[PDB]
Design a binder for this molecule. Sequence first.
Ligand SMILES: *C(=O)[C@H](C[C@@H]1CCNC1=O)NC(=O)[C@H](CC(C)C)NC(=O)[C@@H](NC(=O)C(F)(F)F)C(C)(C)C
Ligand SMILES: *C(=O)[C@H](C[C@@H]1CCNC1=O)NC(=O)[C@H](CC(C)C)NC(=O)[C@@H](NC(=O)C(F)(F)F)C(C)(C)C
Lengths: 299, 299
Amino acid sequence: SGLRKMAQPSGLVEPCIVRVSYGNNVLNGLWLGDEVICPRHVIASDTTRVINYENEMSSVRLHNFSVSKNNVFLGVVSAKYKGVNLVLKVNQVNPNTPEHKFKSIKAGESFNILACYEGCPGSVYGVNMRSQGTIKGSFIAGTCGSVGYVSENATLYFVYMHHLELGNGSHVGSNLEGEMYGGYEDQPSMQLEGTNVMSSDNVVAFLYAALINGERWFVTNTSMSLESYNTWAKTNSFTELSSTDAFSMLAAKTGQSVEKLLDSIVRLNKGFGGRTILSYGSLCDEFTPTEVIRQMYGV
Amino acid sequence: SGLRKMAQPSGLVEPCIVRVSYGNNVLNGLWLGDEVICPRHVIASDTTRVINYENEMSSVRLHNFSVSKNNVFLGVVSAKYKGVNLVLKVNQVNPNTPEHKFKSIKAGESFNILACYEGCPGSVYGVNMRSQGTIKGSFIAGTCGSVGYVSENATLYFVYMHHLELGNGSHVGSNLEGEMYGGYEDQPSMQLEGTNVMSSDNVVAFLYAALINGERWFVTNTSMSLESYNTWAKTNSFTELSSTDAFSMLAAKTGQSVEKLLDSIVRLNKGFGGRTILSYGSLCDEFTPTEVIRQMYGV
Ligand SMILES: *C(=O)[C@H](C[C@@H]1CCNC1=O)NC(=O)[C@H](CC(C)C)NC(=O)[C@@H](NC(=O)C(F)(F)F)C(C)(C)C
Ligand SMILES: *C(=O)[C@H](C[C@@H]1CCNC1=O)NC(=O)[C@H](CC(C)C)NC(=O)[C@@H](NC(=O)C(F)(F)F)C(C)(C)C
């Protein structure tokens, strides 16, 4: 038993992290083949004030970049913007480039962060994309360019590169094609997040994890129909649940139907009455149904 | 900003994990040089009944083992107990054996789990040793032999091998010398964990982390002396705090003294009253002061 937010192992991603610096700015990049992708604000003269990226590009000099893997430095032979990222061509192919694809993450999906500090992989942890295209991670100065990835089908996907933190602490990155999640700008300007919408699929998965782990105080002899729940969800910042089909095995193993847990969500969103669920004090939408199933029962 | 429980990257450990089965039992082994270390209950004919490990070793047949990794099958040439572990000499040396040491974890210390599912590294997450020698992880059938590790000053230490789960869900493992943390037996018997004693240092670090992250509802201008707290702590299953010196920097950056947080601990111990702190609904002792500092400020 137990429930912990997991990361998938990091071994294929670690050899791809490089240190990229320009001027007094230092962050991380992703070295694949003979290319390094990193956030374009590494070339900005002053990241604390509004940046004219056309002027920064006009004044850039390739010899002002420093790119390195474990204190061995690479020659930079080309630099281009691609959206909000720089794409650098370097003079050596990464001999540890894994087979990989690029994909974009959608709201409610889980992935892994390899958090890196100035070119060194430091730590690995799981996150879940919020409705507004943000994640709640843990990023400080020096960790831009930290990389999000997910492995599915034994296919490794790179899905995230870290750029900024909003005023409310939410974290904003791009995909590896240089499109910023959520449409945020890579600018030190006040940008508002917008109302967070909880993933109903993930909150049901969480309550099933709680049941499996022996927590059941929130279940009562009450059950809420799917359409009734979806009507409530529309005015309570929860997503609509398309069907209960993803939960069939969990319902069978716990003896609790999804509609029993839809009624729990409605009651618990009002408040827990001072109780906790697996040491959470409010509903958690960071675990997907497949995530829970894999963690509780194996692949 | 942000605080998540993190793991150190897993790339050096992943290539050492092998699948070990014997009869109906399947778990994980740690393959280093020409040795595979795994929990000895893999050769128990019935793990659900009291095991006579002397009889099991006397009846063992090496041809009954299956040890494998990807397309590699490893033949067992000899098998020996070392405390509660089996040490299997195998017919091939691990070509990806990393430089490494072994050490033991003490209560209050953090380390990393590579959760392995019948030979396959599946996830990586961080844990903290509890007072009674247990951890709160996520382990299911097929995950015994999952490996705990820590890296300090670029030195990789192997520190934990997973064996069993107590009736209250606490997880029990051994060091790599085969001594079971907490002294528990590798038997299906009534073993009670005993009262959990929270690490006061860690809870203080947790509250500092919150403050740094802009959460401050739980601090007043009331304080509690180190001596009065330690007296409360002896009666209320918290460790006694030796000094406030571990937190001099945290107090400086936050403007809140350890004594202000000691009073928070006593008030919060009954519960968060419907509020949360860094998305925990009750006090958390899983982060050390050093852990919090490096995550929130860098090395
Ligand atoms: C990587 O270079 C950092 C990562 C930041 C640092 C603190 N936590 C993070 O996630 N990125 C920045 O410093 C970034 C550079 C811009 C050119 C995009 N700026 C910010 O994240 C700032 N945020 C804002 O100005 C805000 F979004 F409007 F709030 C802060 C103030 C440095 C966080
Ligand atoms: C690895 O082979 C499993 C891991 C367990 C399975 C559920 N969660 C875990 O951490 N270990 C065992 O099956 C172990 C074998 C004994 C011979 C050591 N048995 C147990 O962990 C049992 N626990 C106990 O009997 C208890 F500690 F007394 F409570 C259970 C009931 C299978 C968990």
